[PDB]
Amino acid sequence: GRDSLIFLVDASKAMFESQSEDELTPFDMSIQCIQSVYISKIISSDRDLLAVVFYGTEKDKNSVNFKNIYVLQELDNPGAKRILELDQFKGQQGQKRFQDMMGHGSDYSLSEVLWVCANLFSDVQFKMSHKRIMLFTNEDNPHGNDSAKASRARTKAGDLRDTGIFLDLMHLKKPGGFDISLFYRDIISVHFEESSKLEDLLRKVRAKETRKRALSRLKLKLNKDIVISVGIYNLVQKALKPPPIKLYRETNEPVKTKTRTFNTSTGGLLLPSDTKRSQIYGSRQIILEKEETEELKRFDDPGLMLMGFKPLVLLKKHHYLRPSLFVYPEESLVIGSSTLFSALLIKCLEKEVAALCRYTPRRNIPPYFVALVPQEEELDDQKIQVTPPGFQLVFLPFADDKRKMPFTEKIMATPEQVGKMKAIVEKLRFTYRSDSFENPVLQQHFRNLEALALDLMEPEQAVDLTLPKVEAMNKRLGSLVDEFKELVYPPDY
Amino acid sequence: RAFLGELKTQMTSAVREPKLPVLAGCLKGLSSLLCNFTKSMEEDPQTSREIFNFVLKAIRPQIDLKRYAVPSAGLRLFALHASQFSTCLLDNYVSLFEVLLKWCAHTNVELKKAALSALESFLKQVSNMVAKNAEMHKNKLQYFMEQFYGIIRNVDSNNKELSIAIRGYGLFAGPCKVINAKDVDFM
Amino acid sequence: NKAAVVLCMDVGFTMSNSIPGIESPFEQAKKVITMFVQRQVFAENKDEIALVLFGTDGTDNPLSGGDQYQNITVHRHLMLPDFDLLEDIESKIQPGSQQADFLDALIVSMDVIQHETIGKKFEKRHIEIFTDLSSRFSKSQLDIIIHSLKKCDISLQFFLPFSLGGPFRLGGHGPSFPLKGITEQQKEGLEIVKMVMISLEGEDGLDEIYSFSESLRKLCVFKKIERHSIHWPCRLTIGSNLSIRIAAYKSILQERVKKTWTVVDAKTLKKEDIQKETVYCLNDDDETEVLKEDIIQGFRYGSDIVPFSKVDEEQMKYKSEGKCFSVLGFCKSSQVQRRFFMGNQVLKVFAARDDEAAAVALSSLIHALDDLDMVAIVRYAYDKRANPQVGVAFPHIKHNYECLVYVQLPFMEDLRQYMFSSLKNSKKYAPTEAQLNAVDALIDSMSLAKKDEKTDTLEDLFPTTKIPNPRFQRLFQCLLHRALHPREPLPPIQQHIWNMLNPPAEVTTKSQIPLSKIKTLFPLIE
DNA sequence: TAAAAACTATTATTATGGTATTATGGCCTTGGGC
DNA sequence: CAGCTAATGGCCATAATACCATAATAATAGTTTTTA
């Protein structure tokens, strides 16, 4: 449920060495990779557990008590001085000191290493799912000498994949990024792409957050006589942080502050009995029970009702407000809405018609009128899903929505502009994407925490464009905005 | 009196039902509380009274005898003169009395005995002011009297199992001092 | 706002008409008018009311004579509202039946505006004559009163029991009554008011002809007197090329309470006893009290405690400045999805105008957007106090006036996605269509908006809009009830409530036998 | 009579949210014959 | 002075907070079974 993800560096010998190359030991590149995912799960803050281990080496860290290994850490959600604790390992001083202080390279034996790290899959005491491992190697030859080691590769390998446990080798630059194809299968283990490097890892997880989540499950009675139960889902919440946590000063420790009510006149206490929930205006104070309030919500019950069918195009935006998060109607428990819900969306979409509902949130609420667009089902060859089949949970518009908005005259433009304006926008347009879109200015703080995480000087201080780039603005389009400026006006801004 | 209050509340607007763990406690140590009261009067009769009256169906059955364990000691330990109460509400109540009697008694369970207990007991308290009252116990005597009395002869033709004990005490409770105001001579 | 409010009301005989279904017109009158009462308690602003009584049995007014002033009673005086003014509803109101004429209460209402607003500063004013139009109708002083209430800047309303053109709701879903139920006396009065309205604000007022029941269907009185959205100053930057002083505006956004359900005392209600317990503690091993609330500001994350302060926060925090709005770029609308329109707060954005030129060129870029299905990518930092934000913004087009609306661009994290096996795979679920088609025909019978008026305006039963949401309404019933009457159990839910709550039964009836084909053709499991 | 497991059901678990609520949030409004 | 300040009168967004409220799982107990 909260799963496994694993760092590993191969060792024969020369790997922790740089191949005498003048940039880095690709070993070290791997080092910052480890840094990058383990750090990454600071941001993503993933109850997935992470692994740091090496092998193939001089001394050992393990419980399996064999040559050419080191544990680094056991499976973990991260730690600040788990980060720091591993932070020694950059730098040639830290290359070496890391190496020798631990000892660096002698021999190894492959599938031995398999059940090594696998036997870090032993380390699981908890609920995990994903078994995912990464070897760091340029190794062209595991060995030529004992091909019984090779049979051991092709032997235990299939076991460990069959173990559901999956390690691959990303294209880490042995020359050509690798030149080897040949025997390599064993070494390695909703439409997307793949990459050979860490940078993708780096930025991709710079802002990243939770993955496996579906929890509170409501229903929809369609009519009074027929059934569906409805899965509540958050495509997101407009995801925010785990928020500021109380820890006292020098003690550093959680306050375990509590709250109740003393009497605020006499030194006595107060109790929910002793108080109530009031509205007050003018002269009259008026007091009614926290109960009385919470059940004044009551109309029906948490649950949902097909309230009808509407033109989809009937409302585009005259309007908009707090989103649908996405309810997928459950079909395992209640199926046939497999079929029902299926052809529902089929034809209602065909009708450009939608199923209105009155949604009743959890432990009641006052419920509300909200449309449900049938959500279509979009999948390509490898099945990118932009539209998981379902409903758009479409809030209806209401008085408050319209509580105010002005109306007055409008003076209008001319085609003389649009002739240029269009292509002007063609310079201002970009094909956009699903991706690289956020409010990082909050991200920057879990950068600021990446600090104490590594305990270093300045953050990653990475780059997303949520802000426009001038060279392109003044580049592709140019100053034709001048033409527009003096079209109808000498502005002085 | 808070706990009294906010459970008095929780019995109301949540599925018309409190949290019975929470009443089991409220009443539970309310045992000792009452033991210390010296004559509750106003709310508390209704407090108890209610709680038992609402213990009477499948509600949120938990260790289902717990549902029944709530009144189990609940009426039982409540022997007070504060527990001399529905002598206010009796002619009404005794209806309810036997309703609960029949209720758990006939409710197939592993604690009947509680029923029997309070049965005898509040039964007694009845009998006690009965012993102290010609006015409110002569007729209303014969009210409660006959209330049970349907059970008195009810035993003759039926199978009540252990409930036999029941009658005798009521079969006493009828004749206590009572041949004075109401002749038990044939009894 | 800050205003005077003239409620000109008929309680009389035909307002007292015994009528099936929906309540009698004067009953209607205190229902809607007392929802005005509601919303006045729910206005919590400077709004006053002085009352013109007609349909009553008596005359109270500056002049009692004239042959007018007949059946004109002055109950109330324009004042900052108070709860006794709430109580007069609960007290005076009756089926008082006796007749005034219409220009009578019209000129009396004139004076209601006149001398009281004199001495009471009110920027906006209104006079609303709610009457079923049963009388001998004075056409005498009509246009006098009309353009003098123009001098009184009087917007105008009328309520009655009908439309100009499975119950019949008293609120929700348009005109509900047998359409010709109009007594034609009230149709000559209809022409009277036609003249009055076409005279003052123009002929458009014939839609401003309203009923009391539609007065329970709509919000109608809600949009009269009230302030427009206020300028949000900053520049929308269009490229390093272009920056523009503009007015951001909050358009569609979520309501909330008017207060928390004040949690204060019981048995007194006096908040003096009232406050919650700070109660900050130590962490562990008796973990005892700590005082001087200040603590570091930190976390755990992962497996790691995250010691930190508010200091290192404040400093180490990059931000926006105090405000900004900057186009981040543009794109076509093709790849783009409504779900993937995200947010709650929405900005109708109009000009910083007067020097309106770049609002015109703004229109230029607008139709540069609309032709090509083009959407806006814009930073927005709210102005008044210190915040960065960024979001999508898009032009909406409704011919008479248009703006771009700032809204949240759903942000890359924002997509949750599962392993879900395709509904494209029905290979475990298919019936015969022969049911599916039929229940489609149901979907028509249940189509809420079907083409109406032959305006191609498909009138959605449940047509959103002037139909509100409970939480407030629900409470509001709680508010008149308990505010105006002692503690009770659940207050009246009066089904105008549920009228709103539930669609009309011509659709529903048309669902019934399809509601049958559901159960029949479509079984259940579990 | 209990007395045995007993696979069953229960109500127990949060992690994760969403509400709903707090708080001012750094601003727009108020003032007076020189 | 010049114009009255200018912090006064007001205060909306936020972020924060709360309550407050579930599945993801995993338990309880549970009432039957005869046995005795």
Swiss-Prot record, chain A:
Keyword rRNA-binding in annotation: no
EC number: 3.6.4.-, 4.2.99.-
Post-translational note: Phosphorylation by PRKDC may enhance helicase activity. Phosphorylation of Ser-18 does not affect DNA repair. ADP-ribosylated by PARP3.
Recorded GO MF terms: 5'-deoxyribose-5-phosphate lyase activity; ATP binding; ATP hydrolysis activity; ATP-dependent activity, acting on DNA; cyclin binding; damaged DNA binding; DNA binding; DNA helicase activity
Subcellular location, principal: nucleus
N6-acetyllysine: residues carrying this PTM: K276, K290, K297, K420
Positions of modified residues (Phosphothreonine): T414
Residues annotated as domain Ku: 220-427
Annotated keywords: Acetylation, Activator, ADP-ribosylation, ATP-binding, Chromosome, Cytoplasm, DNA damage, DNA recombination, DNA repair, DNA-binding, Helicase, Host-virus interaction, Hydrolase, Immunity, Innate immunity, Isopeptide bond, Lyase, Methylation, Multifunctional enzyme, Nucleotide-binding, Nucleus, Phosphoprotein, Systemic lupus erythematosus, Transcription, Transcription regulation, Ubl conjugation
Annotated segments matching region DNA-binding: 236-300
Chain positions with Phosphoserine modification: S18, S265, S436, S479
Superkingdom in the source lineage: Eukaryota
Region: Interaction with XRCC5, residue numbers: 332-441
Subcellular location: Nucleus; Chromosome; Cytoplasm
GO cellular component: chromosome, telomeric region; cytosol; DNA-dependent protein kinase complex; DNA-dependent protein kinase-DNA ligase 4 complex; extracellular region; ficolin-1-rich granule lumen; Ku70:Ku80 complex; membrane
Record's note on what induces expression: In osteoblasts, by FGF2.
Gene Ontology biological-process annotations: activation of innate immune response; cellular hyperosmotic salinity response; cellular response to gamma radiation; cellular response to X-ray; double-strand break repair via classical nonhomologous end joining; double-strand break repair via nonhomologous end joining; innate immune response; negative regulation of DNA-templated transcription
Site of covalent link Glycyl lysine isopeptide (Lys-Gly) (interchain with G-Cter in SUMO2): K246, K276
The family this protein is said to belong to: Belongs to the ku70 family.
Name of this protein: X-ray repair cross-complementing protein 6
Species of the source: Homo sapiens
Parent sequence residues shown: 34 to 534 of 609
Swiss-Prot record, chain B:
HEAT repeats (start-end): 91-126
Tree of life domain: Eukaryota
Localization of this protein: Nucleus; Nucleus, Nucleolus; Cytoplasm, Cytosol
Post-translational modification: Autophosphorylated at two clusters, the T2609 cluster and the S2056 cluster. Autophosphorylation induces a conformational change that leads to remodeling of the DNA-PK complex, requisite for efficient end processing and DNA repair.
Role this protein plays: Serine/threonine-protein kinase that acts as a molecular sensor for DNA damage. Involved in DNA non-homologous end joining (NHEJ) required for double-strand break (DSB) repair and V(D)J recombination. Must be bound to DNA to express its catalytic properties. Promotes processing of hairpin DNA structures in V(D)J recombination by activation of the hairpin endonuclease artemis (DCLRE1C). Recruited by XRCC5 and XRCC6 to DNA ends and is required to (1) protect and align broken ends of DNA, thereby preventing their degradation, (2) and sequester the DSB for repair by NHEJ.
Assembly notes: DNA-PK is a heterotrimer of PRKDC and the Ku dimer (composed of XRCC6/Ku70 and XRCC5/Ku86). Formation of this complex may be promoted by interaction with ILF3. Component of the core long-range non-homologous end joining (NHEJ) complex (also named DNA-PK complex) composed of PRKDC, LIG4, XRCC4, XRCC6/Ku70, XRCC5/Ku86 and NHEJ1/XLF. Additional component of the NHEJ complex includes PAXX. Following autophosphorylation, PRKDC dissociates from DNA. Interacts with DNA-PKcs-interacting protein (KIP) with the region upstream the kinase domain.
Family to which the UniProt record says this protein belongs: Belongs to the PI3/PI4-kinase family.
Entry protein name: DNA-dependent protein kinase catalytic subunit
Parent-protein residues present: 198 to 384 of 4128
Swiss-Prot record, chain C:
Induction: In osteoblasts, by FGF2.
Residues modified as N6-acetyllysine: K139, K250, K317
Residues with the Phosphoserine modification: S240, S243, S303
GO BP annotations, alphabetical order: activation of innate immune response; cellular response to gamma radiation; cellular response to leukemia inhibitory factor; DNA damage response; DNA recombination; double-strand break repair; double-strand break repair via nonhomologous end joining; hematopoietic stem cell differentiation
Keywords assigned: Acetylation, Activator, ADP-ribosylation, ATP-binding, Chromosome, DNA damage, DNA recombination, DNA repair, DNA-binding, Helicase, Host-virus interaction, Hydrolase, Immunity, Innate immunity, Isopeptide bond, Nucleotide-binding, Nucleus, Phosphoprotein, Ribosome biogenesis, Systemic lupus erythematosus, Transcription, Transcription regulation, Ubl conjugation
PTM annotation: ADP-ribosylated by PARP3. Phosphorylated on serine residues. Phosphorylation by PRKDC may enhance helicase activity.
Cell compartment(s), UniProt: Nucleus; Nucleus, Nucleolus; Chromosome
GO molecular function terms attached to this record: ATP binding; ATP hydrolysis activity; ATP-dependent activity, acting on DNA; damaged DNA binding; DNA binding; DNA end binding; DNA helicase activity; double-stranded DNA binding
Quaternary structure, from the entry: Heterodimer composed of XRCC5/Ku80 and XRCC6/Ku70; heterodimerization stabilizes XRCC5 protein. Component of the core long-range non-homologous end joining (NHEJ) complex (also named DNA-PK complex) composed of PRKDC, LIG4, XRCC4, XRCC6/Ku70, XRCC5/Ku86 and NHEJ1/XLF. Additional component of the NHEJ complex includes PAXX. Following autophosphorylation, PRKDC dissociates from DNA, leading to formation of the short-range NHEJ complex, composed of LIG4, XRCC4, XRCC6/Ku70, XRCC5/Ku86 and NHEJ1/XLF. (Microbial infection) Interacts with human T-cell leukemia virus 1/HTLV-1 protein HBZ.
Family the UniProt entry places it in: Belongs to the ku80 family.
Gene that specifies this protein: XRCC5
